[PDB]
């Protein structure tokens, strides 16, 4: 009727599509280097 539509459109992840249309898996790492107390970094030798 009106412009109403379901606001979720399925992606046709076909294997025959081109490389620019082949689905990509994305992982994003977000961190804030602001707070003075830290909890995680790589290992380094300590000193007195």
């Amino acid at each position: 009727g009106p412009n109403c539509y379901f606001p979720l459109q399925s992606y046709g992840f076909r294997p025959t599509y081109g490389v620019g249309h082949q689905p990509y898996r994305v992982v994003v790492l977000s961190f804030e280097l602001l707070h003075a107390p830290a909890t995680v970094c790589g290992p380094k030798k300590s000193t007195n």
């Binding site: 539509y5 599509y17 081109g18």
Partner: protein, 96 residues
């Protein structure tokens, strides 16, 4: 005259609907006909009256229903490879 014509030309031979030097207020026509398959990829105006632009390259088509999946920016298929290819940066309204 373009939006409500009884007969168009060939679907591959789109009509030069040059929308220039006027107010492209075609949003009222949304109420004239039940626009289904509504896919505005770059701009989605429910009203359109301000900006002036040089080129519009508007097109007129007559197609089926279960074929709009090939109507998308940078898409491949029967329409793109045989009738009309939509650019990767296709910013326009496909109104079927």
């Amino acid at each position: 005259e373009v939006f409500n014509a009884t007969r168009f030309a060939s679907v591959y031979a789109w009509n030069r609907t040059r929308i220039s030097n006027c107010v492209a207020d075609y949003s009222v026509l949304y109420n004239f006909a039940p626009f289904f398959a509504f896919k505005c990829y770059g701009v989605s105006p429910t009203k359109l009256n301000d900006l002036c632009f040089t080129n519009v390259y508007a097109d007129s088509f007559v197609i089926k229903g279960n074929e709009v999946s090939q109507i998308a920016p940078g898409q491949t298929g029967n329409i793109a490879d045989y009738n009309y290819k939509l650019p990767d940066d296709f910013t326009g309204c496909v109104i079927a």
